[PDB]
Structure 1
Amino acid sequence: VIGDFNCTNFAINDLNTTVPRISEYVVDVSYGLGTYYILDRVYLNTTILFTGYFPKSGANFRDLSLKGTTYLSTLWYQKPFLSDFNNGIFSRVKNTKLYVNKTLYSEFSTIVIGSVFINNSYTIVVQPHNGVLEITACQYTMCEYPHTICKSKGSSRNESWHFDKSEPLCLFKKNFTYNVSTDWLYFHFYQERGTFYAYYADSGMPTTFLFSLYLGTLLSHYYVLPLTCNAISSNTDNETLQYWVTPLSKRQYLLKFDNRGVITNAVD
């Protein structure tokens, strides 16, 4: 289970549907993908040695996305899917693009980052809403079996990942835009000296600072929520979710900046 709140007993089973698939693709930082722009700094026309929270060059990713129809498996809410956060993660996220009539809708898995996922502790939630990325850190009463839905093509489930009827205490709450036409989003989520840091991109480039938040407490776990949908399968659209993850470590990189201050190259 994720949290301890019994939000539902509708269509729960114990089926071993899948395990996290390993990417044929590997971390290749040679053009700055898997790096980030350093906070609010600009570096121009120079090479920097920077020790940051970076993925290991040549590492694989695990796809942690789960697509459901009606049933949720209890085995989805355990290791290997419920994961130790350690220093942090680099995410490569497929923007799943669905069409209703001719209109584009953007879907991808919500990620939650926390410790025990009980409402006496802060859970960071990063959730798409069709070109809006809602980010919160809010003492959520997380469900035992949390999931999101396709709002575009619908689900046989109501959306359910927390049960807070009154608004819970928030440390952070902000919305960021992203380009709904993209193929990939990239994220860094890491922690240092009790502060959480988030970065994102939506084009295959070094990530840009979203926010940072002082927690003091270590984040110990993360979990990519299942998404339940009547679409996103071979019998309906041949579309897929993908939420690829690889661990960060405290690591020295060479970063090369051009005269525009763009990271054109990096070395692990």
Structure 2
Amino acid sequence: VIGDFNCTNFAINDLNTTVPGISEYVVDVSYGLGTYYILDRVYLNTTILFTGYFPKSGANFRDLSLKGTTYLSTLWYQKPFLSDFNNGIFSRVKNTKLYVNKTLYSEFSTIVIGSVFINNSYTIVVQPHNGVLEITACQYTMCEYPHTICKSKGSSRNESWHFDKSEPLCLFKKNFTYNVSTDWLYFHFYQERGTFYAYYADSGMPTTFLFSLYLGTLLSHYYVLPLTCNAISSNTDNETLQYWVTPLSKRQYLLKFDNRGVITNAVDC
């Protein structure tokens, strides 16, 4: 279970919905995937050897995104889904673009990073709001079975992943905009000497620095909240959620910059 507050008991079972296990996909950084721009520097028409937090080429992505309709499986809130954070993670996220009255809506899975997920520890939450990427790191009272809902098409159950009636004390709270039209979003989340770092990019594969947050504590776990939504199924609309995650580590990369400063290719030495 995540956290320890009894938020609800409606429609909970222990069914192993994942008859097909966690889907897997092979990392391939030959086209810049998993790389990020270096500080404020600019490199032109050259190849650089750089050491940083990058995915291991040839490793596997894991599709941790989960979609439900009415029932939540207790198995969703344990290993292997609840995963260790270690140095960090690289995330490749599909932007599930739905339509209501021919109006576009952007949805994708929420991710929570923390150590114990209780109101005496800080938990980082990255939640999309249809073009607005809300990021907070707050002492949330995380539920056993946190989950988000699908604001455009609705859901059969109310949204609940924290129970704080009063506003919890916390360190960071900001909103970042992202292009709702793009099909893929990339994120780097890693920690170093008690400081949390975040990079992202909604256009192009290489990511750019978002923010850094001092925590003074070691993050140990991350989890992708299941999403329950009436739509997003082959019986109503051929759309699916995807949240690919792979571990990060300190590795040396060969980075090639084109004549305009865009990382076009990379190699994992």
TM-score, normalised to structure 1, is: 0.96
Question: Judging changes above 3 Å, is the alpha-carbon distance between structure 1 residues 22 and 59 closer, same or farther for their aligned structure 2 residues?
Answer: farther
User: Does structure 2 retain, via aligned residues, the 8 Å contact 1:21–1:62?
Assistant: no
Gaps of 5+ in 2: none
User: Does structure 2 retain, via aligned residues, the 8 Å contact 1:20–1:64?
Assistant: no
User: Does structure 1 retain, via aligned residues, the 8 Å contact 2:146–2:160?
Assistant: yes
1:240 and 1:7 mapped to 2: Cα distance?
A: 27
The CA deviation at 1:20 is 7.8
User: Does structure 1 retain, via aligned residues, the 8 Å contact 2:24–2:62?
Assistant: no
Percent of aligned pairs sharing the same letter: 100
The CA deviation at 1:205 is 1.6
1:190 and 1:210 mapped to 2: Cα distance?
A: 12
User: Does structure 2 retain, via aligned residues, the 8 Å contact 1:23–1:60?
Assistant: no
2:79 and 2:58 mapped to 1: Cα distance?
A: 24
Alignment length (residue pairs): 268
Give the secondary structure class of the aligned counterpart of 1:143. strand
1:207 and 1:15 mapped to 2: Cα distance?
A: 38
1:138 and 1:19 mapped to 2: Cα distance?
A: 35
Question: Judging changes above 3 Å, is the alpha-carbon distance between structure 1 residues 194 and 4 closer, same or farther for their aligned structure 2 residues?
Answer: same
1:49 and 1:21 mapped to 2: Cα distance?
A: 37
The CA deviation at 1:258 is 2.6
The CA deviation at 1:242 is 0.7
User: Does structure 2 retain, via aligned residues, the 8 Å contact 1:96–1:108?
Assistant: yes
Question: Judging changes above 3 Å, is the alpha-carbon distance between structure 1 residues 159 and 29 closer, same or farther for their aligned structure 2 residues?
Answer: same
State the match for 1:79 in structure 2. 79
Gaps of 5+ in 1: none
State the match for 2:45 in structure 1. 45
The CA deviation at 1:41 is 2.9
User: Does structure 2 retain, via aligned residues, the 8 Å contact 1:22–1:61?
Assistant: no
Give the secondary structure class of the aligned counterpart of 2:76. helix
The alignment yields a C-alpha RMSD, in angstroms, of: 1.4
User: Does structure 2 retain, via aligned residues, the 8 Å contact 1:138–1:169?
Assistant: yes
**Which stretch shows the higher mean deviation, 42-51 or 105-114?**
42-51
The CA deviation at 1:33 is 1.3
State the match for 1:91 in structure 2. 91
CA displacement, residues 212-249 of structure 1 (integer Å, 9 cap, x when unaligned) = 11112111000000001010111110211111111111
Question: Judging changes above 3 Å, is the alpha-carbon distance between structure 1 residues 20 and 3 closer, same or farther for their aligned structure 2 residues?
Answer: farther
**Which stretch shows the higher mean deviation, 44-53 or 96-105?**
44-53
1:84 and 1:251 mapped to 2: Cα distance?
A: 19
2:249 and 2:156 mapped to 1: Cα distance?
A: 40
TM-score, normalised to structure 2, is: 0.96
The CA deviation at 1:79 is 0.3
